[PDB]
């Protein structure tokens, strides 16, 4: 089926460089107007760049002179070179096809955005890569209400996104709450994953949270004991 | 079977994938109809598309028998 | 540049409700307005173009009205599948611009939060850092306040919080506030308390723990 796949996203220091590549299946993207739309909290959905059905390049004001877009025919891909990156460029970048509709009057391009890629993340920050520290949130009398007890893991000071948090290698899914990460003044991220269980299960079951930080090759398995 | 198609943007005729021996037209009105005319959709199919409210559907079997309205079935 | 403002930004609705989102532009754009649906962690999907025409495959319960500067998206019969964030986008002038987005959340009955507190582990204390964590679980609505009191003195500028996205089973929320000090600051005090204000409580709940004890 028709689809868009994009790659090359990553994590760079301000003034650094990145190259996003986008490929299609089921259609030739040079037939259509292709666009890049980025999404981040604080600026929303924002149109960035475009390569129309005639080979012309287009750029938004806040990005002109730093980004370049081109067909690379030998790759069958749509490339976006991002130079002199700055912090506010941190966003999820979507490769997007514009609609081509035929009428009795002619062909009309980019009335809307019909096919979207999955999205690739781009992080620009002063921080360096760092694996997280995993601290247990031990269940106690102050973390039990009725027959239900709460226990969790504190995943502090890591960069960049993302981490994947599971409990008992996926065996535990019911009652799990994994919070969105927060950016601290250090420029490092920190989140917590919790899980409500029957308080009687703290003696019939062992709880191990698994934190995987792919950018730093870090995989932590912390046993959460009541104290 | 050779069939007109709205995939390309200069509408052309294409040999159709195996198993698809049918041609079709679909025409209806957008919210752009009063300023652009009716939408036109051309291509091939293995069976004829079901008709929905307020749209025309044509089918055939010879070659290039689903032309653009502003075109002829040559 | 044309500016798009959606109203409201969030709204609750039951399955079967008639949902109405409006979208307003900084000037006339005729009917060159599109509507997109987006689920979390997923790319947006096109729903309406030309302010009124449905994109093939979209259920007919969706409809779009409006021309000029005022536009409307309407779900006549709300279904579970339809709980997402909706964006309008103008295609009249360059550059293309989107609205801030509108989240459609599930309405349910008020639920008071279970409040849990966690002291810093021995492991974190070794590294000279102490983090106290307060957990509000399975509550509705989303609006809640959390104070931190160390030896009954309020705290400011040393805590941050995060809220889960609405649960798919019971449709509540959860919050985790994190008070972080040094091991030095943590040792000069005895009582660490979490004060919680929420609509589902008659009076604020307080959970505390004495250090070591």
CATH number of C114-210: 2.60.40.10
Q: Do residues A207 and A224 make contact, with C-beta atoms less than 8 angstroms apart?
A: yes
CA distance A142 to A149: 9
Contact assignment for C91 to A179 by CB distance below 8 Å: no
Chains with 3+ CB–CB pairs under 8 A to B are A, C
Residue C48, SS3? strand
Q: Do residues A160 and A189 make contact, with C-beta atoms less than 8 angstroms apart?
A: yes
Q: What is the CA radius of gyration of chain A?
A: 23
Phi first, then psi: give them for residue C115, nearest 5 degrees.
Answer: -110, 125
CA distance C89 to C26: 13
Report residue A206 as tokens. Answer: 């062992």
Report residue A162 as tokens. Answer: 């993302």
CA distance C144 to C136: 9
Measured on CA atoms in the order A51, A52, A56, A59, is the torsion positive or negative?
Answer: negative
Q: What is the DSSP letter of C83?
A: -
Report residue C144 as tokens. Answer: 């809640």
Q: Which residues contact A68 (CB under 8 A, 6 or more apart)?
A: A57, A80, A81, A83
CA distance A167 to C156: 33
Q: Do residues C113 and C175 make contact, with C-beta atoms less than 8 angstroms apart?
A: yes
Report residue B58 as tokens. Answer: 């044509």
Query: Which residues in chain C have Cβ-Cβ distances shorter than 8 Å to A60?
Result: 95
**What is the 3-state secondary structure of C151-209?**
CCEECCCCEEEEECCCCCCCCCEEEEEEEEEEHHHHHCCCEEEEEEEECCCCCCEEEEE
CA distance C188 to C44: 51
CA distance A177 to A174: 9
Size of interface A-B (CB pairs under 8 A): 34
CA distance B54 to C145: 54
Phi first, then psi: give them for residue A58, nearest 5 degrees.
Answer: -135, 150
CA distance A72 to A21: 9
Measured on CA atoms in the order C55, C60, C62, C63, is the torsion positive or negative?
Answer: positive
Same fold, C4-106 and C114-210: yes
CA distance A217 to C178: 26
CA distance C66 to C50: 10
C-alpha distance across the termini of chain A, in Å = 54
Q: Do residues C183 and C189 make contact, with C-beta atoms less than 8 angstroms apart?
A: no
Interface of C with A in 53-92 (CB under 8 A): 55, 87, 89, 91
Report residue C168 as tokens. Answer: 């798919």
The vertex-C142 CA angle with C155 and A176, nearest 5°, equals: 90
Q: Do residues C182 and C138 make contact, with C-beta atoms less than 8 angstroms apart?
A: no
CA distance A131 to C172: 31
Beta bridge partners of C11: C104
**What is the 3-state secondary structure of C52-68?**
CEECCCCCCCEEEEEEC
- How many residues make up chain C in this entry? 213
Domain A3-137 class in CATH: mainly beta
Size of interface A-C (CB pairs under 8 A): 126
Test the C interface: residue of A113, A189, A209, A221 with most C CBs within 10 Å: A113
Domain C4-106 class in CATH: mainly beta
Task: Render chain A in DSSP notation, one character per residue.
Answer: --EEEEE---EE-TT--EEEEEEEESS-GGGS-EEEEEEETTTEEEEEEEE-TTS-EEE-GGGTTTEEEEEETTTTEEEEEE-S--GGG-EEEEEEEEEEEEBSS-EEEEEEEEEE---EEEEE-SPPPBPPEEEEE---GGGEETTEEEEEEEEEEEBSS--EEEEGGGTB-TTEEEPPPEE-TTS-EEEEEEEEEEGGGGGT---EEEEEEGGGTEEEEEE----
Nearest residue on chain C to B33, judged by CA atoms?
C50
Q: Closest Cα of chain C to A104: distance in Å?
A: 17
Residue appearing with tokens 């000069």: C188
Contact assignment for B7 to A27 by CB distance below 8 Å: yes
Q: Do residues B28 and B56 make contact, with C-beta atoms less than 8 angstroms apart?
A: yes
Q: What is the CA radius of gyration of chain B?
A: 12
Q: Residue A195 — left, alpha, or beta (φ > 0 → left; ψ -120 to 50 → alpha)?
A: beta
What are the extents of the domains in chain C? 4-106, 114-210
Is the N-terminal amide bond of C95 cis, ω within 30° of 0?
yes
Q: Do residues A206 and A226 make contact, with C-beta atoms less than 8 angstroms apart?
A: no
Q: Do residues A126 and A195 make contact, with C-beta atoms less than 8 angstroms apart?
A: no
Interface of C with A in 165-204 (CB under 8 A): 165, 167, 174, 176, 178
Q: Do residues A37 and A19 make contact, with C-beta atoms less than 8 angstroms apart?
A: no
| Maximum distance among all Cα pairs of chain C, rounded to whole angstroms | 69
Report residue A170 as tokens. Answer: 């996926």
CA distance readout (Å), A12 to A127, B24, B43, B45, C124: 9, 51, 46, 48, 29
Q: How many CA atoms lie within 13 A of C124 on its CB side?
A: 28
Report residue A111 as tokens. Answer: 């009335």
Q: Do residues A139 and A226 make contact, with C-beta atoms less than 8 angstroms apart?
A: yes
Q: Where are the extended beta strands (E) located within B6-71?
A: 12-15, 22-28, 39-45, 56-60
């Amino acid at each position: 089926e028709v689809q868009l796949v994009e790659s090359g996203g990553g994590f760079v220091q301000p003034g650094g460089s990145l190259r996003l590549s986008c490929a299609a299946s089921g259609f030739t993207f040079s037939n259509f107007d292709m666009h890049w739309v980025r999404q981040s909290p604080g600026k929303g959905l924002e149109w960035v760049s475009g390569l129309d059905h005639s080979g012309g390049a287009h750029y938004a004001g806040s990005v002109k002179g730093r980004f370049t877009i081109s067909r690379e025919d030998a790759k069958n891909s749509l490339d976006l070179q991002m130079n002199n990156l700055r912090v506010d460029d941190t966003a999820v970048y979507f490769c997007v096809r514009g609609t081509l509709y035929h009428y009795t009057s002619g062909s009309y391009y980019s009335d809307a955005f019909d096919i979207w890629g999955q999205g690739t993340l781009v992080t620009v920050s002063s921080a360096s890569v760092k694996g997280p520290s995993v601290f247990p949130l031990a269940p106690s009398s102050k973390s039990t209400s009725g027959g239900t007890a709460a226990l969790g893991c504190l995943v502090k000071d890591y960069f960049p996104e993302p981490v994947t948090v599971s409990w008992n290698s996926g065996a535990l899914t019911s009652g799990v709450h994994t919070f969105p990460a927060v950016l601290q003044s250090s420029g490092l991220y920190s989140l917590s994953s919790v899980v409500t269980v029957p308080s009687s299960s703290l003696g019939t079951q062992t709880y191990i949270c698994n934190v995987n930080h792919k950018p730093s090759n870090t995989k932590v398995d912390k046993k959460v004991e009541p104290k | 079977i050779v069939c007109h198609t709205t995939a390309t943007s200069p509408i052309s005729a294409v040999t159709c994938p195996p198993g698809e021996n049918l041609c079709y037209r679909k025409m209806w009105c957008d919210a752009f109809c009063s300023s652009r005319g009716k939408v036109v959709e051309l291509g091939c199919a293995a069976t004829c598309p079901s008709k929905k409210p307020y749209e025309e559907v044509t089918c055939c079997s010879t070659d290039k028998c689903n032309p653009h309205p502003k075109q002829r079935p040559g | 540049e044309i500016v798009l403002t959606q109203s409201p930004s969030s709204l609750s609705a039951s399955v079967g409700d008639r949902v109405t989102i409006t979208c307003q532009a900084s000037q006339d754009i005729s009917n060159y307005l599109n509507w997109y649906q987006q689920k979390p962690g997923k790319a947006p999907k096109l729903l309406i173009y030309a302010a009124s025409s449905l994109e093939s495959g979209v259920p007919s319960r969706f409809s779009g009205s409006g021309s000029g500067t005022d536009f409307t998206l309407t779900i006549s019969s709300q279904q579970p599948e339809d709980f997402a964030t909706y964006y309008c986008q103008q295609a009249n002038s360059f550059p293309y611009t989107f609205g801030q987005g509108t989240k459609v959340e599930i309405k349910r009955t008020v639920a008071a939060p279970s409040v849990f507190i966690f002291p810093p582990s021995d492991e974190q204390l070794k590294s000279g850092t102490a983090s106290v964590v307060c957990l509000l679980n399975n509550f509705y609505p989303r609006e809640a306040k959390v104070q931190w009191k160390v030896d009954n003195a309020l705290q400011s500028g040393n805590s941050q919080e995060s809220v889960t996205e609405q649960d798919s089973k019971d449709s509540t929320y959860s919050l985790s506030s994190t008070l972080t000090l040094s091991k030095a600051d943590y040792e000069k005090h005895k009582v660490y308390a979490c004060e919680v204000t929420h609509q589902g409580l008659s009076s604020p709940v307080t959970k505390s723990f004495n250090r070591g004890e």
